[PDB]
Symmetry: D2
């Protein structure tokens, strides 16, 4: 459809929001490349998607992996029209219990990996290509034990504002999708190792959304598709928040 004839790269495409986004973009006719660290999930994701979705085992935090990943895109497709820097995660640590590892792990995948994924992608991206970063409402709010994650997500949104000007000559527009609480494996894992612990954590998080439910991952993916499509032609540097109103109220 609108994305037909377009080449899309979704980092962290093997599960959750990155998975649903790869599905939606491909359903619009785009050629999608997805990345994951675990070979088994990547193979299941490629098989579940079908529709000419290409899988590459890559770690966004490893600079050499990014070089290899973009080489496969250059060798096969030869261009990148859509980039969704989805690969990221959250971990909880209250102030007074923040380890250097906890800080470094969050920033390397949530922020550093975003910077160098984007910088490496650029030679492939033509004029009028679209870049989508994954933010969070936690980037604009405060939650106990979430300061490090929240700071990383705020850093992500901040990158898009300056990159508007850095990429103005090349004609690529960069925007941010900031999801609210989305039903994923990653969100469930915060609730615990136990199944009641993940079930009760998802239920409390749902109770925080004003419409009263968690998002299905497809609901975030529609937002990425919109930014990937030509309809977003006048959107640049913007944050689109789909949170059921949680951070809007």
């Amino acid at each position: 459809k609108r994305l037909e004839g377009k080449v899309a790269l979704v980092t962290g495409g093997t599960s959750g929001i990155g998975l649903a986004t790869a599905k939606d973009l491909a359903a619009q006719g785009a050629r999608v490349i997805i990345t994951g660290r675990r070979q088994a999930e990547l193979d299941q994701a490629v098989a579940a998607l079908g529709q000419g979705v290409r899988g590459v085992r890559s770690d966004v935090t490893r600079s050499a992996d990014l070089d290899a990943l973009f080489e496969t895109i250059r060798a096969t497709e030869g261009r990148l029209d859509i980039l969704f820097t989805n690969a990221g995660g959250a971990s909880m640590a209250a102030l007074g219990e923040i380890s250097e590892q906890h800080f470094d792990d969050t920033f390397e995948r949530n922020v550093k990996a975003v910077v160098f994924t984007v910088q490496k992608a650029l030679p492939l991206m033509p004029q009028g290509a679209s870049i989508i970063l994954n933010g969070a409402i936690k980037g604009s709010t405060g939650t106990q034990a979430f300061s490090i994650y929240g700071a990383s997500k705020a850093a992500v949104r901040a990158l898009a504002r300056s990159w508007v000007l850095d990429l103005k000559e090349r004609g690529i527009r960069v925007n941010v999708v900031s999801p609210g609480s989305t039903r994923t494996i990653g969100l469930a894992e915060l609730g615990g190792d136990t199944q009641e612990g993940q079930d009760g954590t998802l239920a409390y998080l749902a109770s925080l959304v004003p419409i009263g439910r968690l998002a299905d991952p497809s609901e975030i993916a529609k937002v990425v598709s919109f930014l990937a499509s030509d309809d977003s032609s006048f959107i640049n540097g913007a944050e689109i928040t789909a949170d059921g109103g949680q951070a809007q109220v």
Copy 2:
């Protein structure tokens, strides 16, 4: 392509500019569109240019009786509203120390008060799962000389959506805001002055302020509204979507 087919949309101020293009894009997606304007002549041209089962009503959003008349027509003609775009609005310039009571009253009556009662009057028609789009501006979040009244009215519109999220939770109607940057429109051109050379230097100057360096086509604003009108925005509530070429984002 029939994305909004079977849905009923109302665009206040549908006869020109952003409202016109939005009515077009909604109709191109299969929606039944109702448009309003103050001038019957432009309204007739707009309805004729759109075709596609677009119904026109001449009404002023600032007149409470017109709003009652307009929604009575929707109730008999279609019997429901699924999409509402409170586009009718305008900007005027007056610096602090030159602000007239006229200038304040007109700006807030159309830009804010009419938005409240357009929305309030439309609620009985709107079913669960309906989408409301208010027309903001980046000027609601920025400062420009001689624009304090317009910018303040636009900030008020965005604020209304945050509380209306909670007010409309039981009915299931979601409220969002599109904040345009500089979009080429008769409205925007007329801000430059009333002479023809004067409007072009204003349109070119406004383009020079945009980071991508061009004014928006009205259709590019309309695509954001259609997205908000469609079910793809199902998890968006109370949010502001800014399409400004990055002007207010930097």
Copy 3:
């Protein structure tokens, strides 16, 4: 004595935040004028404040009252260094029950009166004068049945951004203090006429503040005093939020 010799006007100085702000400004050496609609409360306020505080009975919504008040300042003090457009209020109406009177009254006092207080004040204000607008966190947040008040307070804050450029030649800086929930007569009145209803509503509102208490008006007054002093020389068009962290999280 940061305000020694400075002339300050607090509209709606007879109760709550405006009263404590007048008390605080005078305690720093300012010459303070306060206004109120009710003659009895105004006289009581002037007597309690002492410290050379002058009261004028005037309504911010009546243009002729606005002319008469500023004529007294020109005749008496001869200039105006600090302006606090405090006179304001909140009323409740959900969508579907908003009357035209509820809208008009809210916007006339909270927005229109702010505009014309400022514009009429300008001829008395010298270069380096300070203008403080009274915002609210409700201007940036969502609360049920508060849409009209919330929009008026957002309008107030936006006025400041443009007034930076309008007043740059005159040399006046405009800033906003946005209070969170502050224990005042006006706020208690939202709780009801009964004392038990005021006790439950204020305690509930206190539970929403992350620090867990309502502000005393003196805590808001300090923010105004800071903005009025020369310490705010590089602050212009900004919003200073004293909410105990409520809208910050």
Copy 4:
């Protein structure tokens, strides 16, 4: 003498904003500790301030240096009422020229050292203490070649929102001062080694401010002193922007 009886630590106290803040904090009666990497300026800073201002040669990025610094405060002063995490910097790299070191250097000092400066200080801080983090308007704006610096500053602001909830039991309030363009050595250095290159950039930066001048470091310092004082008791998680209206407009 509002801050008299209070112990203040300013990282990066030997020059610029941190120096002016150390001056202003000490002028209010606080016992001030300043840190710098270079012994020479740290000695010049301590001697120029006088007023019992104590200097420690420490690097905020060195965990061992931080440990020693707080040990001297615990051994000498014994408590910390005010924390200003000022030590930080900007460097420019446009997208396509961002080095991995440039990212790491920026985020080490501006974000990581802030996290661990605060975490190590906490055991010394009594209930009612005030923490001030140093942001920037660039954390909320976009400038060509400034994405990493802006992203670091946006992360600082996000840290305060969550830290409000983390520190609520301790009763320590966290706020952020976000300066606009301030006349400092660091700002001049962005104009490069050449003298007229530094003058030409600084006047250009002054032209970007709506009031049309750069801030003196004392104007930012007044904001910090206000947040350090008890006058800010109802401010928590807030950002106070002193930018001459640049990001406000």
